[PDB]
C-alpha cells in the first residue's frame, strides 16, 4: 500500500506537531495498526503505536504523548513533548492487519523541526 | 469514496447455488481489495472473504473455502461472490465492505 505524509512540519512553542497519514488504496481491513517511528542514523526506533477499529477511531489512549484518530484512510497524528533536540524524521508505517491478505505500507517520513 | 450495492440474495435450497453481486458507485473499485461478510441473526458481521487485488490473490474463511469463489467484473465496477453447495448454515445477511466501516446495504441469503 501508498502512504501519503507530509515532507516537512513545525512543531509548536509548546511541543506540539500534528500531520495527517494516509494510506491507498482503502483495502478492506477490521483493524488497522499505525505506528510513528522515528529514524536516528541507521536506526529506527518506535515512537507510539496503536491499533484501530470501527469502533475505536481514537487511539494512542496508553500514551501521555501521542494522540491519533482515525477516519477513512486517514489517520490524524499529534505528537507532544517535542524538544528541540527531537528534530528529526517520522515515519508514518501503515498496516493492515485482519482479515487476510495483510497489507503493510511505509510513508516517506515527516521531518519535524521544533521552535 | 465508494458505494457499495449488494443484490443477488434470495432463497436456495440445500446443494443449491446463488451468486452475489457487490456493484460500486462513485469511483473504481478495480484496484480494491472488497470484503465479504455474513451476519445470522443476533451476530456481528463476520468475514467470508476478500477479493484479490494486483498484488495478492483472493482469500477465504475456512468455513466457505472450496464452496465459495470471489470474482471482478471491472467494467460494471463490481464483484461477485459464487456460492455453490450451500448449507442451511449459510443463512445470513450478507454484505460487502471495503477499508474498515464503507458497508453495503446487505442483501439476505436463505437456504431452507
Known amino acids: 500500500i501508498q502512504v501519503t505524509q507530509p515532507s516537512v512540519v513545525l512543531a509548536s512553542s509548546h511541543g506540539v506537531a500534528s500531520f495527517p497519514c494516509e494510506y491507498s488504496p482503502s483495502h478492506n481491513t477490521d483493524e488497522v495498526r499505525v505506528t510513528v517511528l522515528r529514524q536516528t542514523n541507521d536506526q529506527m526506533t518506535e515512537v507510539c503505536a496503536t491499533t484501530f477499529t470501527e469502533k475505536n477511531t481514537v487511539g494512542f489512549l496508553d500514551y501521555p504523548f501521542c494522540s491519533g484518530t482515525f477516519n477513512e484512510s486517514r489517520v490524524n497524528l499529534t505528537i507532544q513533548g517535542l524538544r528541540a533536540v527531537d528534530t528529526g524524521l517520522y515515519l508514518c508505517k501503515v498496516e493492515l492487519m485482519y482479515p487476510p491478505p495483510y497489507f503493510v505500507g511505509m510513508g516517506n517520513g515527516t521531518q519535524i523541526y521544533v521552535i | 469514496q465508494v458505494q457499495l450495492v449488494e443484490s443477488g440474495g434470495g432463497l436456495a435450497q440445500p446443494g443449491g447455488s446463488l451468486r452475489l453481486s457487490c456493484a460500486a458507485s462513485?469511483?473504481?473499485?478495480?484496484?480494491?481489495?472488497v470484503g465479504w461478510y455474513r451476519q445470522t441473526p443476533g451476530n456481528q458481521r463476520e468475514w467470508v472473504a476478500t477479493?484479490?487485488?494486483?498484488?495478492?490473490?483472493?482469500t477465504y474463511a475456512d468455513s466457505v473455502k472450496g464452496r465459495f469463489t470471489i470474482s471482478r467484473d471491472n467494467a460494471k465496477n463490481t464483484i461477485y461472490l459464487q456460492m455453490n453447495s450451500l448449507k442451511p448454515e449459510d443463512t445470513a445477511v450478507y454484505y460487502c465492505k471495503t477499508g474498515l466501516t464503507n458497508w453495503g446495504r446487505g442483501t439476505q441469503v436463505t437456504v431452507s
Open positions: 462513485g469511483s473504481t473499485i478495480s484496484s480494491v481489495a
Open positions: 477479493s484479490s487485488t494486483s498484488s495478492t490473490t483472493a
